[PDB]
Design a protein around this ligand. Structure first.
Ligand SMILES: *[C@@H]1O[C@H](CO)[C@@H](O[C@@H]2O[C@H](CO)[C@@H](O[C@@H]3O[C@H](CO[C@H]4O[C@H](CO)[C@@H](O)[C@H](O)[C@@H]4O)[C@@H](O)[C@H](O[C@H]4O[C@H](CO)[C@@H](O)[C@H](O)[C@@H]4O)[C@@H]3O)[C@H](O)[C@H]2NC(C)=O)[C@H](O)[C@H]1NC(C)=O
Ligand SMILES: *[C@@H]1O[C@H](CO)[C@@H](O[C@@H]2O[C@H](CO)[C@@H](O[C@@H]3O[C@H](CO[C@H]4O[C@H](CO)[C@@H](O)[C@H](O)[C@@H]4O)[C@@H](O)[C@H](O[C@H]4O[C@H](CO)[C@@H](O)[C@H](O)[C@@H]4O)[C@@H]3O)[C@H](O)[C@H]2NC(C)=O)[C@H](O)[C@H]1NC(C)=O
Ligand SMILES: *[C@@H]1O[C@H](CO)[C@@H](O[C@@H]2O[C@H](CO)[C@@H](O[C@@H]3O[C@H](CO)[C@@H](O)[C@H](O)[C@@H]3O)[C@H](O)[C@H]2NC(C)=O)[C@H](O)[C@H]1NC(C)=O
Ligand SMILES: *[C@@H]1O[C@H](CO)[C@@H](O[C@@H]2O[C@H](CO)[C@@H](O[C@@H]3O[C@H](CO)[C@@H](O)[C@H](O)[C@@H]3O)[C@H](O)[C@H]2NC(C)=O)[C@H](O)[C@H]1NC(C)=O
Ligand SMILES: *[C@@H]1O[C@H](CO)[C@@H](O[C@@H]2O[C@H](CO)[C@@H](O)[C@H](O)[C@H]2NC(C)=O)[C@H](O)[C@H]1NC(C)=O
Ligand SMILES: *[C@@H]1O[C@H](CO)[C@@H](O[C@@H]2O[C@H](CO)[C@@H](O)[C@H](O)[C@H]2NC(C)=O)[C@H](O)[C@H]1NC(C)=O
Ligand SMILES: *[C@@H]1O[C@H](CO)[C@@H](O[C@@H]2O[C@H](CO)[C@@H](O)[C@H](O)[C@H]2NC(C)=O)[C@H](O)[C@H]1NC(C)=O
Ligand SMILES: *[C@@H]1O[C@H](CO)[C@@H](O[C@@H]2O[C@H](CO)[C@@H](O)[C@H](O)[C@H]2NC(C)=O)[C@H](O)[C@H]1NC(C)=O
Ligand SMILES: CC(C)C[C@H](OC(=O)N[C@@H](CCC(=O)O)C(=O)O)C(=O)O
Ligand SMILES: CC(C)C[C@H](OC(=O)N[C@@H](CCC(=O)O)C(=O)O)C(=O)O
Ligand SMILES: *[C@@H]1O[C@H](CO)[C@@H](O)[C@H](O)[C@H]1NC(C)=O
Ligand SMILES: *[C@@H]1O[C@H](CO)[C@@H](O)[C@H](O)[C@H]1NC(C)=O
Ligand SMILES: *[C@@H]1O[C@H](CO)[C@@H](O)[C@H](O)[C@H]1NC(C)=O
Ligand SMILES: *[C@@H]1O[C@H](CO)[C@@H](O)[C@H](O)[C@H]1NC(C)=O
Ligand SMILES: *[C@@H]1O[C@H](CO)[C@@H](O)[C@H](O)[C@H]1NC(C)=O
Ligand SMILES: *[C@@H]1O[C@H](CO)[C@@H](O)[C@H](O)[C@H]1NC(C)=O
Ligand SMILES: [Ca+2]
Ligand SMILES: [Ca+2]
Ligand SMILES: [Cl-]
Ligand SMILES: [Cl-]
Ligand SMILES: [Zn+2]
Ligand SMILES: [Zn+2]
Ligand SMILES: [Zn+2]
Ligand SMILES: [Zn+2]
Lengths: 693, 693
């Protein structure tokens, strides 16, 4: 028969391996001819696999590229202005790729041009708390200095934003072996570690969900009216460039001024990690000079959108999407995910060719220009927002399938917790020592929930991936899953480097492609259940549990300030009342969902609509403060780290560093305003689960 | 049987008359005990009539009242500071009401306090073009002057906004007999004209859809966090007061300075209508002094919300709503509408008691605090926005049922044109000379469409009534209907005066209550069809026709500036393309709606959802420029006159007075941006009518 087991059994590790090889032989940088060619290939193959339609959706968006005849680099210059040390112009290419054309050299996408020259300040990971330590405790002023920061811990766009606000005139990002070289493992090509010449590419935008910098709110189509560069969203104001640790060692070794304040500031290089400013006495007249000549350029991008029409509810969409554009070869990022999507499409198409169709419509997406700011998914969702908000059931992301080989990682809305627990109990574990055991069992053992015994850890969705528009802007239930390591925001060692190749994966991560297969089963199984279950597989009671946990958490933060809560009458009573009400109403809804007349399709679809619109109810059309495209009131990307999720973000940001605000009455008034918005939104969402009339 | 005819036949003129008498014996000012008592009475009666539930929804909103022991008035003061003339402290009460307590004296709600003294400038109707004429052509400066303006033509809030921007330090509004005294008719109590002591009350806010000034975006519930007065939405900055024409004649008769520029500036009083500033030579040292002592006060208001649960689609809502609060007795406004709603509820409840239920849920609303800025409907819609935007089928308004006795007036979304034409062909005309003819026939004869032969006029929805939140904020198809005169924005002569009584209606407007009955049939018949028709009674092809008319119109405005359109490459091609596409897709959708398998409830409800969400598709979540709660891209209230609808408002406002802008490149860039937003929105709405997968 045509059930989930038939779907799952059709998935093959050997097919995923073949597809991954096929997708990783040449670079597929967004906006380049080779990435358009791959888009056309995937369009062709998805049609052959059996989808009902497969179209390209193109947009013309702002991208950024180095100047091929005017290379980016950093120098140490002496008092005469001679450049006595230069950083590399390219990463040494890996074995057998030393003749591959069009490898983009390391750069920070969207850096402005400039040639700033000055003294170096070392800022650790350039986190908000690193800058607090420098300015408030150490009394070091970054104004007009070049800051050097190690990658890791937070999104690099937040590092650059923090450096700008500190007054820096340039930023140098580098990979420290403390964060990108695991002890006892060899550098690529002999292991999975970053060599000293390796460099992490990546954009440094602060888009806050806007998509293309020139067209916030609206798709970058053929008649779009663009902002000028000066009014564009999210662009950095100071030049930025990434380097590897051989080059970093040359810039850091001469540093003087203050000692590092403690050991959490010291990486693994044989240097003092002095904060500066500038170099020790003998070299005190030498300076650092950046030379950045990259250009921003409106460029065409192509999403591939495949449709498998539903038999019963064709106007309900379950979406499986992941990106296709890569920095270089994309051996892990994104092609390990794209190969998994390809095999899922192939498996669904096999069932379709035998006469089966899912209950609801499945959409498959191959997004472009993700690496330049989630641009392809966001423009597409801007174009199709009315269809998505009235018809969108769920979005399952499909970027990198592996970032390690230890255990499963899932991040998703609470609405999908039960779905994920149930699916993983039915899947086989691929782990050594768990032969014959469920994936649920291995996952729960290796990654225990911090809160509940016998349950696995499932994280909040953060951001930095293509689910952002669907979840935080539009309010469509979203999830992601991949295999992971036993630091989660720093990336694996070869992240966004030229060394991320097919060989990396086949030799060191997943030789038998069994972890890829497991991830294909999780992502595909989730899509299958969402698109085929008669009642949508969402449990509203799980949202009630987490809402109470988040309310306790935010209350606890506020309670660090008892005097102010007294003075300004700051009560969380309304939020706890709303959460209590949500808990009560969700319980009664669950009872009706279990008990309703199962022969009545209108009550069923009424109740499926209540399930589908529950995530939608947490959207506030006015957005969060100064972040209009982050509209979900329960979850937003952290204002300090785009990759991390923050709960009750409006209240969290109102409380953050409140003791430093010059007008406490105004600051605590804003805390109270955010408590009111959150209590109202939770009650309003609860009331969508009440009897409808 | 239980069909529309049974519903319509149960409606009785004599019941409407009894209810109107019952609702108009004492004042029902918002926030007063007598209006809470009436709310409780209507709640009780709607339960007795047979509704499934009837609840009060209360909010605590900013209202405004005169100070009972410190009366508002205006003076002419001489050089010594003696007050030689004072305007009235109250309207002479009508016969038999001279002992009624709690008649609020004439005032402008939300005026700040003050006692400004200065010279008078007469500004005609205080329209944007009146101020253009004064400043640009006549070179008269209103800065630090008190302006005197006649009511009429535009909403009084726009007059006050215009006066503020001209630099005025106070505004006096008065009713000129040119606008409020029809030739050959007697003053009340002997006819329907305004006496010289009559005065029009009314708020002077500029809320732009925000609702309660202190809580924009969120319901004014028990834990709401309020803006301070200084950050409140829409409050005027200068004192304002209304007077009658006996008092106006005393203020105007002494005016000097410039002659009126032409006859359109002269009303019917025996005065020169000199523009000023100030008085003629002999009285040149006399000035005008206002004394305004009204206070703004957060006050509880009560909406009555009645539910008649649908038998088949209980999660789809058809809403019939109108206000209950009045300035004084509300003989026309709103009780002629409220009495009609009461009888409609009674008729639906009679069918319900015999075992019938409508297909979809009907909600009935008695809104409070409408007169203070549509506050009750807007707060309720803010509280329930998630339910309304996913479930709201249509909103039918029910304010005043009569404003004359000549013919029918309908204003509605194009989606309801066909519904209204069909319903009125089935109803009897109440007009003399049309005995035995349809309402459609009498209406079409008396009010011909300017565009099509054999069709009646149907206007755009403007604003200034309780449909605003549902249509312009939320995008729910809305309509209104009343009997009208053969100047439509000025109001009938006794509008918002103490003379608007039950006797006014029974003696002079509708002695046999036949026009009230006809309006009950139109409003009730519309609700019946919307709540019971298997396929929703919306015709998308009618939107396509009007979109082309509005695109031609806005193109024509731009084409007054051919040189600039060349210089800045301003093309409407994308808008016309979108409208052409909408026309094509709507035609194909109509074909499918006629042809789809009529046995398939999922295709039906899929197609009913496409019909329901079509109005919703014209909403832009970012709102219009500086007016975040006006979100519909096709229709907004005119920026110059809240009562009037404007089509393609974003482009219209970008083009308005563009020749006067100091930076034409920036101004024409904004025109192009608005063309892009409108073309995109029309295409996006069209695509909601495409096949779904
Ligand atoms: C969680 O869910 C519960 C319901 O189980 C909600 O309870 C409501 O809570 C508010 C309190 O914040 C109550 O509001 C109070 O209503 C009183 C009148 O209620 C009657 O009349 C209304 C119709 O107008 C009916 O809906 C209702 O059923 C009752 O019959 C007012 O008199 C109260 O105001 C007075 O007291 C307050 C506080 O001291 C003063 O500030 C006022 O000035 C005034 O003197 C008050 O407004 C409401 O009645 C409750 N509804 C119920 C029990 O059905 C929670 O609100 C909800 N949590 C959240 C966050 O929404
Ligand atoms: C009204 O509805 C019609 C459809 O009936 C829409 O027509 C589209 O209009 C745009 C023009 O604005 C067309 O865009 C052009 O697409 C070309 C490629 O199209 C093919 O490939 C795509 C997938 O990527 C398919 O969807 C499509 O079916 C085709 O197979 C591009 O090559 C064009 O770009 C080139 O020309 C322009 C103009 O000179 C240059 O600026 C570019 O730099 C470039 O050289 C262009 O982008 C689109 O193909 C049309 N779709 C159709 C016919 O299906 C209207 O857009 C719509 N009106 C509105 C307002 O939306
Ligand atoms: C994940 O799997 C669990 C375990 O199977 C699912 O929970 C179970 O769901 C079924 C079907 O709704 C429940 O059965 C029902 O029970 C009620 C009351 O006893 C009865 O009236 C109904 O007729 C029906 O038999 C079952 O109780 C429930 N078990 C639990 C909660 O332990 C769960 O739904 C799955 N999650 C999904 C699909 O998201
Ligand atoms: C207002 O009344 C008019 C006139 O009755 C309605 O239009 C008519 O609607 C019916 C029912 O859909 C149409 O009949 C259909 O015709 C097609 C093709 O001929 C056929 O395939 C179907 O089986 C069905 O018989 C009829 O053609 C149409 N007449 C017109 C447009 O002149 C209109 O729907 C009403 N408006 C509403 C309810 O909003
Ligand atoms: C990746 O696989 C695709 C599909 O098998 C290959 O593209 C095909 O190549 C053959 C031979 O050159 C052509 O005849 C077909 O037209 C191509 N098909 C499609 C759908 O594009 C491609 O060669 C493979 N790439 C690599 C690097 O191995
Ligand atoms: C680092 O790179 C710079 C730029 O190429 C080198 O400086 C140049 O050297 C050439 C040849 O001696 C001169 O003609 C250019 O005028 C120099 N340009 C600048 C901008 O200084 C520099 O020699 C390199 N340094 C090292 C250590 O290799
Ligand atoms: C308007 O009509 C209502 C309803 O008939 C009247 O209120 C009733 O009055 C009687 C006698 O005083 C009471 O016994 C009932 O309890 C009232 N019913 C309700 C539902 O309130 C009211 O008197 C009428 N008002 C006027 C001015 O005639
Ligand atoms: C208009 O009203 C004002 C205010 O009541 C009158 O002026 C007052 O007159 C009394 C008695 O003569 C004095 O005690 C007050 O001091 C006056 N107040 C002010 C503010 O001037 C005035 O007489 C009235 N004018 C007319 C023509 O009736
Ligand atoms: C390795 C993870 C921390 C981040 C990784 O995602 C990304 O690399 N995202 C890109 C784009 C992020 C964005 O622009 O939001 C980046 O961080 O440069 C992932 O989710 O797999
Ligand atoms: C007589 C009409 C021009 C206006 C009349 O509506 C109103 O009186 N509305 C009130 C409230 C308007 C508002 O605040 O938007 C007013 O104009 O004062 C109606 O729609 O019947
Ligand atoms: C890149 O650099 C070259 C060589 O210096 C220059 O001629 C060209 O203008 C630059 N390209 C850009 C700005 O796109
Ligand atoms: C840092 O340095 C600059 C002077 O170059 C100054 O504008 C700024 O206020 C300084 N900040 C301090 C001392 O905190
Ligand atoms: C794969 O798993 C083995 C066994 O635990 C481990 O030693 C190795 O480090 C893993 N490879 C990667 C890339 O994590
Ligand atoms: C109204 O005026 C009286 C008498 O002058 C005054 O005592 C009172 O404060 C005022 N009421 C207000 C401001 O509500
Ligand atoms: C009107 O008068 C004031 C001076 O009292 C001045 O500020 C303003 O600029 C004047 N406007 C003109 C002359 O247009
Ligand atoms: C009612 O209709 C008659 C007859 O046309 C007309 O003379 C009279 O003015 C009307 N009354 C009102 C209030 O319009
Ligand atoms: Ca965009
Ligand atoms: Ca509000
Ligand atoms: Cl992912
Ligand atoms: Cl009305
Ligand atoms: Zn990626
Ligand atoms: Zn990446
Ligand atoms: Zn009214
Ligand atoms: Zn009114």
């Amino acid at each position: 028969k045509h059930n989930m087991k038939a779907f799952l059994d059709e998935l093959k590790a050997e097919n995923i391996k073949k597809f991954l090889y096929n997708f990783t032989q040449i670079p597929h940088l967004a906006g380049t001819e080779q990435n358009f060619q791959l888009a056309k290939q995937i369009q062709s193959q998805w049609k052959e696999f059996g989808l009902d339609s497969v179209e390209l959706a193109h947009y013309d968006v702002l991208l950024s590229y180095p100047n091929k005849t005017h290379p980016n680099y950093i120098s140490i210059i002496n008092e005469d202005g001679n450049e006595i040390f230069n950083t590399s112009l390219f990463e040494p290419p890996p074995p057998g790729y030393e003749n591959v054309s069009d490898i983009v050299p390391p750069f920070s996408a969207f850096s402005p041009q400039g040639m700033p020259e000055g003294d170096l300040v070392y800022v650790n990971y350039a986190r908000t708390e690193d800058f607090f330590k420098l300015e408030r405790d150490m009394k070091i002023n970054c104004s007009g200095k070049i800051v050097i920061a190690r990658y890791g811990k937070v999104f690099r766009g937040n590092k650059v934003k923090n450096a700008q606000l500190a007054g820096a005139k340039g930023v140098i990002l580098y990979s420290d072996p403390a964060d990108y070289f695991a002890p006892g493992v060899k550098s690529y090509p002999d292991g999975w570690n970053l060599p000293g010449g390796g460099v992490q590419r990546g954009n440094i935008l602060n888009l806050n969900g806007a998509g293309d910098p020139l067209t916030p709110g609206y798709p970058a189509n053929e008649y779009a009216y663009r902002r000028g560069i000066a009014e564009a969203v999210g662009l950095p104001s100071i030049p930025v460039h990434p380097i590897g640790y051989y080059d970093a060692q040359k810039l850091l070794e001469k540093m003087g001024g203050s000692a590092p304040p403690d050991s959490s500031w010291r990486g693994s290089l044989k240097v003092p990690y002095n904060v500066g400013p500038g170099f020790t006495g003998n070299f005190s007249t030498q300076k650092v000079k950046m030379h950045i000549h990259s250009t921003n350029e409106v460029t065409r991008i192509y999403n591939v959108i495949g449709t498998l029409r539903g038999a019963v509810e064709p106007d309900r969409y379950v979406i499986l999407g992941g990106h296709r554009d890569s920095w270089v070869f994309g051996g892990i990022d994104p092609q390990s995910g794209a190969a998994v999507v390809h095999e899922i499409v192939r498996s669904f198409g096999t069932l379709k060719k035998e006469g089966w169709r899912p209950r609801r419509t499945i959409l498959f997406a191959s997004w472009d220009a993700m690496e330049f700011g989630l641009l392809g998914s966001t423009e597409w969702a801007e174009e199709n927002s009315r269809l998505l908000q009235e018809r969108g059931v769920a979005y399952i992301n499909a970027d990198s399938s592996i970032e390690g080989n230890y255990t499963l990682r899932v991040d998703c809305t609470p609405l999908m917790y039960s779905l994920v627990h149930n699916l993983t109990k039915e899947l086989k574990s691929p782990d050594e020592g768990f032969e014959g055991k469920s994936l649920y069992e291995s996952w729960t053992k290796k990654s225990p929930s911090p809160e509940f015994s016998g349950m696995p850890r499932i994280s909040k969705l953060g951001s930095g991936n293509d689910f952002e528009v669907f979840f935080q802007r539009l309010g469509i239930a979203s999830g992601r899953a991949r295999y992971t390591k036993n630091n989660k925001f720093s990336g694996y060692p070869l992240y966004h480097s030229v060394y991320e190749t097919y060989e990396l994966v086949e030799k060191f991560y997943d030789p038998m492609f069994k972890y890829h297969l497991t991830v294909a089963q999780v992502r595909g199984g989730m899509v299958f259940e969402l698109a085929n279950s008669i009642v949508l597989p969402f449990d509203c009671r799980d949202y009630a549990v987490v809402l109470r946990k988040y309310a306790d958490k935010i209350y606890s933060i506020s309670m660090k300030h008892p005097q102010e809560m007294k003075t300004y009458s700051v009560s969380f009573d309304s939020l706890f009342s709303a959460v209590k009400n949500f808990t009560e109403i969700a319980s009664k809804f669950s009872e009706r969902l279990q008990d309703f007349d199962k022969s009545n399709p209108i009550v069923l679809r009424m109740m499926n609509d209540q399930l589908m619109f529950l995530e939608r109810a947490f959207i506030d059309p006015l957005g969060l403060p100064d972040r209009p495209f982050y509209r979900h009131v329960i979850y937003a990307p952290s204002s300090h780290n785009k990759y991390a999720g923050e709960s009750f973000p409006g209240i969290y940001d109102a409380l953050f560093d409140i003791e430093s605000k010059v007008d406490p009455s105004k600051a605590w008034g804003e805390v109270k305003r955010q408590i009111y918005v959150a209590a109202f939104t939770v009650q309003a969402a609860a009331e969508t689960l009440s009897e409808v009339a």
